[PDB]
Amino acid sequence: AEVARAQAALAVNISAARGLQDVLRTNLGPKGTMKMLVSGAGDIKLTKDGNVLLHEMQIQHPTASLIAKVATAQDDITGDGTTSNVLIIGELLKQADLYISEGLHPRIITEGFEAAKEKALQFLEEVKVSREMDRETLIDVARTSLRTKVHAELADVLTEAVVDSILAIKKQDEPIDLFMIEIMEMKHKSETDTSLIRGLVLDHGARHPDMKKRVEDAYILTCNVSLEYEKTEVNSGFFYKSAEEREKLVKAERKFIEDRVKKIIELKRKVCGDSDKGFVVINQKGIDPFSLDALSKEGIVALRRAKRRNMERLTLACGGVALNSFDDLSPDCLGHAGLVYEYTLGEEKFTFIEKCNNPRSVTLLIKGPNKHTLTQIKDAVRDGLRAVKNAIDDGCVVPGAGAVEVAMAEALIKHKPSVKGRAQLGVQAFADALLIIPKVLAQNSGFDLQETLVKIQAEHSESGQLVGVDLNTGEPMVAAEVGVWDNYCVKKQLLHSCTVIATNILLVDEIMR
Amino acid sequence: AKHFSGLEEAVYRNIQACKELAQTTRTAYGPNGMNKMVINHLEKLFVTNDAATILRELEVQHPAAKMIVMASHMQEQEVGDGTNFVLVFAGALLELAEELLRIGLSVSEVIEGYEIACRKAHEILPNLVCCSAKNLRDIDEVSSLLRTSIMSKQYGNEVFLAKLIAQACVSIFPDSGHFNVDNIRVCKILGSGISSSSVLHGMVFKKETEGDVTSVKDAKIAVYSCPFDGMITETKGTVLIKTAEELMNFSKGEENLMDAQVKAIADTGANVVVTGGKVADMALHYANKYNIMLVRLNSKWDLRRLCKTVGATALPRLTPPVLEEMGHCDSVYLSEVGDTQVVVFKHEKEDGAISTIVLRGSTDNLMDDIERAVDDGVNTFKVLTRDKRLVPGGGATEIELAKQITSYGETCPGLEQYAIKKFAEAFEAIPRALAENSGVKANEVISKLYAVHQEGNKNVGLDIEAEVPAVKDMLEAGILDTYLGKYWAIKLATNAAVTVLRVDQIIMA
Amino acid sequence: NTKRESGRKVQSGNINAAKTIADIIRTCLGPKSMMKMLLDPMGGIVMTNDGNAILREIQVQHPAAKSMIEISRTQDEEVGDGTTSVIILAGEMLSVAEHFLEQQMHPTVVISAYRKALDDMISTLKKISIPVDISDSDMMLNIINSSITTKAISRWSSLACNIALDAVKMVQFEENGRKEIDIKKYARVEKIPGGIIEDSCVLRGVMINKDVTHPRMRRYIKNPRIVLLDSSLEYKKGESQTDIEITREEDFTRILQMEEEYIQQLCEDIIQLKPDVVITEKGISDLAQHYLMRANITAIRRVRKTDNNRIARACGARIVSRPEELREDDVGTGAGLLEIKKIGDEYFTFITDCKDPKACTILLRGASKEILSEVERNLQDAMQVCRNVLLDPQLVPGGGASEMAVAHALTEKSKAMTGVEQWPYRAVAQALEVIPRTLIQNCGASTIRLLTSLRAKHTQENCETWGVNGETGTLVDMKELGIWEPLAVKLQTYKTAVETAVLLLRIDDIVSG
Secondary structure, X not given: OOEEOHHHHHHHHHHHHHHHHHHHHHOOOOOOOOEEEOOOOOOOEEEOOHHHHHHHOOOOOHHHHHHHHHHHHHHHHOOOOHHHHHHHHHXXXXXXXXXXXXXXXXXXXXXXXXXXXXXHHHHHHHHOEEOOOOHHHHHHHHHHHHHHHOOHHHHHHHHHXXXXXXXXXXXXXXXXXXXXXXXXXXXXXXXXXXXXXXXXXXXXXXXXXXXXOEEOOEEEEEEOOOOOXXXXXXXXXXXXXXXXXXXXXXHHHHHHHHHHHHHHHHHHHHHOOOOOOEEEEEEOOOOOHHHHHHHHHOOEEEXXXXXXXXXXXXXXXXXXXXXXXOOXXXXXXXXXXXXXXXXXXXXXXXXXXXXXXXXXXXXXXXXXXXXXXXXXXXXXXXXXXXXHHHHHOOOEEEEOOOOOHHHHHHHOOXXXXXXXXXXXXXXXXXXXXXXXXXXXXXXXXXXXXXXXXXXXXXXXXXXXXXXXXXXXXXXXXXXHHHOOEEOHHHHHHHHHHHHHHHHHHHHEEEEEO | OOOXXXXXXXXXXXXXXXXXXXOOOOOOOOOOOOOOOOEOOOOOEOOOOOHHHHHHHOOOOOHXXXXXXXXXXXXXXXXXXXXXXXXXXXXXXXXXXXXXXXXXXXXXXXXXXHHHHHHHHHHHHXXXXXXXXXXXXXXXXXXXXXXHHHHHOOOOOHHHHHHHHHHHHHHHOOOOOOOOOOOOOOOEOOOOOOOOOEEEEOXXXXXXXXXXXXXXXXXXXXXEOOOEOOOOOOOOOOOOXXXXXXXXXHHHHHHHHHHHHHHHHHHOOOOEEEEOOOEOHHHHHHHHHHOOEEEXXXXXXXXXXXXXXXXXXXXXXXXXXXXXXXXXXXXXXXXXXXXXXXXXXXXXXOOOOOEEEEEOOOXXXXXXXXXXXXXXXXXXXXXXXXXXXXXXOOOOHHHHHHHXXXXXXXXXXXXXHHHHHHHHHHHHHHHHHHXXXXXXXXXXXXXXXXXXXXXXXXXXXXXXXXXXXXOEEHHHHOOEEEHHHHHHHHHHHHHHHHHHHHOOOOOOO | OOOOOOHHHHHHHHHHHHHHHHHHHHHHOOOOOOEEEEEOOOOOEEEEOOHHHHHHOOOOOXXXXXXXXXXXXXXXXXXXXXXXXXXXXXXXXXXXXXXXXXXXXXXXXXXXXXXXXXXXXXXHHHHHOEOOOOOOHHHHHHHHHHHHOOOOOOOOHHHHHHHHHHHHHHOOOXXXXXXXXXXXXXXXXXXXXXXXXXXXXXXXXXXXOOOXXXXXXXXXXOOOOEEEOOOOOOOOOOOOOOOOOOOOOHHHXXXXXXXXXXHHHHHHHHHOOOOOEEEEOOOOOHHHHHHHHOOOOEEEEOOOHHHHHHHHHHHHOOOOOOOOOOOOOOOOOOOOEEEEEEEOOEEEEXXXXXXXXXXXXXXXXXXXXXXHHHHHHHHHHHHHHHHHHOOOOOEOEOOOHHHHHHHHHHHHHHHHXXXXXXXXXXXXXXXXXXXXXXXXXXXXXXXXXXXXHHHHHHHHOOOOOEEEOOXXXXXXXXXXXXXXXXXXXXXXXXXXXXXXXXXXXXXXXXOOO
16 A cells, blocks of 8 residues: 655654654754753743653654653663763764665664674773762762753752762662652742752641640651541441431441540550650541641541651651551651651641651652742652762772763774674764764864864873763863762663664565555 | 744744733833733723833733743832833844844843843942831831832822821831831722822721620721621521511520621620621611621731731631630720721720721722732832842942943954843833833933933933923932842843743643 | 456566565565565554564555465464564465466466476475474574574574473373474463573473462362362352332342352352362352362363363373262363462463373463563474474475575586476576575675676585575585575475465466455
C-alpha cells in the first residue's frame, strides 16, 4: 500500500530527530536557558531539563516516540544529562547522514558507531578517576550537575542543600535517594525559596496552644482511622437509609469519639507520662471536635492530615511505626522522632518529626506564591539530588565541562580503524558527536562554539591539559581542576543511551503509513 | 491559542505583552491615575487606574503577559504603590532585549545584567529614599502619605479619602504600628456625595435589619446563612404557596418554629441572629416579639464580611451554634452608615482589623474609584507600618538610578555593559509615562531631571503645570513613595521581567 | 458479485506487494539487518525484522500479500521458522520472471520452471549439504545456534541450544511414531515467567502448570499418579435446581453455589482415596479444590483427557475409578523427573519425560518474565534444528552461497535443459542470488563482483559449503565460518516460495464475491 522505504524514508526521521534536538540547544547549562513548556493545563513549565520538556508536550514525530525513552532512561539511570543525550545523537546523525549522503551504507555507518563508543567508553574509563564522595567534592559535582540540568543561580542555592540531603545517608548504595526526597512546598513571599530539613515533616498538623507547642520526647501515634471510631484499624459502617437506624447512629458515635480520645489520653499518661513528655497524635483523617481540644489539653498534640507518605517516612525516619489507631500500646510502636515540632509557615502547618532514628527521610520545604516558579525550583531540586547522589554513591566521578569530549575525539585518532573505513566513519562521525556539548556551551557562550573548541583541542592536545569550554564565559579552562564534574555514571550510561537510538535510526530504513 | 514555534514565543509574544503593559499604567499611573472602562462577564462599566485590578479583570492569553500579572498582585498585596509601575518598568526593561537581540546578546547574559543591576539598584534605593514620616496614631500624617499613595492610583478627591483611609487604619488598630491584610470593610452604598463616604469601626450589615432589639449593648451573633423563613438546608420547611389552607397552618407554626429556631440560636446565645437566608413574617413577627435581631437575607458578602471578622462560621443548616459558630461584636446599634439606615456593629476593642467604611460615591464607578484608591491606602499604611522610609514621587528616583546604572554599566565591561546600561533606561519610562499622562515628553523631563542633576527628589509630577513640563521637589510636594514601595516594585518587576525572558518556545503537536 | 480482472495488471499487482514486502526484510534477515518500522496513524512506531508482523498491523493488499502471510505462516507453521525467507524468495521469482517471460510470452514454463528450479535446490543442496552428528549436542549446537540467530539473537542461542539439544530427541508423539520431525504439541515450548537464567533447567517432557498450582497441594511426590474421575469423582456436573422461595435471601446465593459443592462432595469422595494427583476434564471448582489440597493431594483441573493421557503415560499415572477400586491401574512411573518450580506462589510442575507421549513441553527461564518470549522463539528455532538435524544431518552451509548454489547450478543446467524452457529456467536462475548478495551489499563494495567472485568461486571452488560470508562478505567455507542453513529450511523455503509464485501467475483475476 503506502510504504516509505530506504534512503528517502529515513530522511524524515533524521530530519525530525536532528530538527527536534536543535531546540534543546537552548538548554544544557547556564548559558542555555530553561525552556518554557505549556500544556492543556496552560501551565508554563520552565525546565532546562530535557526529560521534563520531552515527555509532556511536543510535535508528533516517529522519532518523538523513541526520544521519549532515552531522556527518561538517563533520568532513570542518573537524574542528570537528560538534556545532554539528545544533542549528541543528531550531531552523530548529521555526521552519519553525510556518509549516507555519500551513499555509504547506513549499515556500514551503523556498524562503526559501536567500537567508537567503546573507544570513548574505555577512554572515559581512562579520563575518569576515583574522586571523593566528600560533600565539598559533591559541591564540585553539585554545582556542575545542577547547571547542565537546572539553573546556575538555582544550582548555587541548591548546591549546599542538595548535597546535604544526599549526605544524610547511612551510606546507602542507592544512586538516587527515595526518602532523602521529601518535598514540602508553599505559597510564600519568595517565588523561589527552599528550606533544608533533615527528618520528616508532616503535610498538615493541628496546632493548638492547648497542645504542646514543643514536643521534645515525641511518641507519635500516626493513625489513618481517626478519633471518630473506637478501637478500630478499620472504619465502621454507616446506615443513613432509614430513620431508626440513623436515629441510633448519631448518639453512639460520641462513644466511638470518647473512647478514642480516651485511648490516647490514658495512653499518653502511659506512654508519654502525664505532662512528663509531649505526646503526638497524627490524624491522617479529620480530628474529632471533642477529641481535637480534648487531645489538645491533655498534652497530646493531635495532628490533622499526615499523608501515607508521611506515614511511611516517619516510621522509617523516627524508627517507630504508624498505627491505624489510638488504642493503648507501648511507646516504641508509636513513632518517636527526637523532636516533633509543628512549624506553621504560610497557611500550611508543617509538623516536623525531627531528630529521627533514621535520617533517611529528609525534607525540603519549597516556596513560592507563583506556581511556575514553585514548579521550576521544586523541580530544580530533584535532578541534583539524583545527579549529585551519583557523585556520593560512586567513588569515581567523571570530569565535566566537556573537557573529556575534546579529549576522546583526538584519542579516537583514526586508522586506528584501519579495518574498513566504515568503522573509520563510525569513529569519525562519533568523534564529532562527542563535541556537541563543548560546542553548545561555547555556542551558548560568547565567541565561537568552534574557535574555542578547536582552541580546546589544540590546547587539550598539548600535554597535561584536560581542558574545556567554560559553561559560562565559554573560555578554555581545565575542567577537573575547577571541580566542575558531571556524575561518573552519566557519561558511560550517556554514551550507551546516545548511540543506541542513533544506531536504531539507521536500522530503520522503512516507515509505512 | 498558546503553543507556537518559530521564535513567536520570545521576540513576539513577549513584546506584545509589553504593549499591554502600556496604558494600564502609562496614563493610569504617576502621582495620579487615569480611568479605563471595564465591561464585565455580566456586563457593566468599570473605570480603573491601578494595573493589577484591571489586568486581573482582563483574562490574558499570553503566557508571557500571564506571568507578570502575578507579580503585580504580589506587589499590590505586599505594596500597592507602583502596582501600575511593575508593568511599565518590566516592559521598558524587556523591550531592551530585541535590540540586544539585533546586537546579538544572550538571554543568559542580559538576565544577569539587569539582575546585578537591580541588585545594584536595590542598593541605591535607600539613599533616594528621602527622609521619612510615620505616625500611625496620626490620621493626618498617614493621610498625606496615603494621599499620594492613593493618588498615584487615584485621580479624585485625594485628601478626603486619605483622611478616611488614614482614619480607619489609624483608628481601627489601637496597636497601629502594625497593619493586617484586611483591616477595613467597606459597605458600598450609593447616593448623597462622595464626601458622604464615612469611616465606621465595626461590622456594617448594609442589609435590612429586623427583630426588635433586646440588647443594642452587646452584639453576640450566632451567624447564619440559614433561612429563618422556616427553611433549614438539610431538610427544608419551605412555605407552601400552592394552597391557602396549608399556608394557614404553617404560618401559625412559623411563630413557634421560629421559636424553636431563635432559641437554638440564642440558647448558646445571640444578640443579633445574623440571617443570610430568607425570613418569614410569622418568623419575624415572633422574632420581633421574641426580641432577637434578624439582619435578614444578608448579602453573602456581608455574610463573608461577618464570617471573617467575628471569627465565626455561618450555619447554612439550622442547628445549635457552638463557640466556633457564634460571632461576637462590641455593639449592635442600628444606625445610618453614610446616612443609610442599617445595622452597624463596633469592632475596635473586640478584635480590630475591621473598620467598616461606607463608600458613598455618586456613581458605582466613583464608588469603585474610592474603592480603587484605598487599595493602596490599605497597603501603603501596611507599608507605612513596615517602613516610614519615604521616597519622593516617582521619576526623581529613577534618574539617579540611571546615572548610577549607566556608569555602573561602563564599569561592567563584557556584554552586560550593554544590558546594565539598558537597565538604566527602563527607569526613564516612568517620567515618560508621567509625561505621557500629563501630555509631554520624557526627553525634556529627562533633560530637566538631569539638568538640576537631582536625582531622587526633584521631578515633574503628574501636573497641570506640566503644560510646560516642569520639575518640582517631589518629597516636599507631598507626592511621595517609600523604600519598599520602590524596592519591591523594582524587585518584582525585574524578576517577572527576567524570568519571562528565560522562557522558550513550546513544542506542541 | 461477478467481477473480472485480467492479464499483467493483476500479476503486476502480484509483483508489487510481495516484492515491496521483500525489500526491508531481506535487508533485515540474516546477520546484516535493518528494521521495518510501521507508522501508526497516531505516529506509533513498530519496528521489527518480521514484515508479517508489520503487514498485519496495516492493510494487507489482496493480490500478493494475502497469499504471502499464509506462505509466511506455512513455513513457520512447518519448521517453526522462515516467515521472512519465503516472502523475499517468492518475491525474487515473482519479480523478474513473468513480465520478462510473458514478454517472451508463456505462463507455462514459468510455472514449470518453479518445479525444475526447485529440485535443483533439492539436487545441489543434499549433495553439498554437510552431515552433522545428531547424537552430539555440539555438532547440533553449531547448526542450531546458526538457526537460533534467525534475526539478531545468539544471546539465548547457547541456552536455547542446550534445552532443544536435549528435548527434541526425547520428543515422541502419543503415537510415538517418530521422534525427529514433530508437531509442536509433541514438542512444546512454554515460557515460564520470572526467575533467572539458572532456572532455565532443561525440561525434556511435558509440563503441567496445573499439576501443582498451590503450596497446599501435593509436595514433590516423585511419581505423580493422576486418578481420572470415574469413581474418585463420581459423576455429578448438574445442579439440585431447588424450588424458589421468597422468604430467604440466601436461596438466591445458595442455588448457584450448589454447582461447585457437588465436586466438593466428589472431592470429599477423592480425599478418602488420596490420589496423589487428581485430573478432571469436567473440571473441579476451587471451592471443591480446597479439600484436595489439604490432603496433600494436588489437583490438575480443567485439563482434557489427552493432555492427561499423554501425561498419565508420561508421568506414568494409574488411571482408575478409585485408587482402591480397580479400573486396571496404569503404571506407577513413566518419568524420571518431577520438578515443581515456583516463581511466586503459583507453582509450575515440570515432569521431564524420556521418550514418552507427553507434550515435550520444555522449561525455559529468562532473566525475567519477558525475554522468555525470545527464548521460546530461540528454542522453537532451536528445536527446529533438533527436529531438522535428527531429520537431516546434512544441511547446507552458506552465506547464501546456497542461495547462489542453486542459482549457478541452474544456469549450468540452463545450458543443459535448453529449449525455450532454459530462458525461464535461466531467468529464474537469477532470482536466487539476490538475497545473500543484498546481505553482502548490506556489506558494501561491489556485491555483484563478490557475486561474480561467488560465481567464480561457485563452480570452481564450491557451491555453498565453501561460500561467501553473509555479514562480512568474504568468500569462506560456511561450515568453516560455522554459518548453517538447514537443508529442510532451504528445502522448505523455495518449495514454499515456488508454490505461491506459481499461483500468483495463475491468478490474473479476482472477484468481489
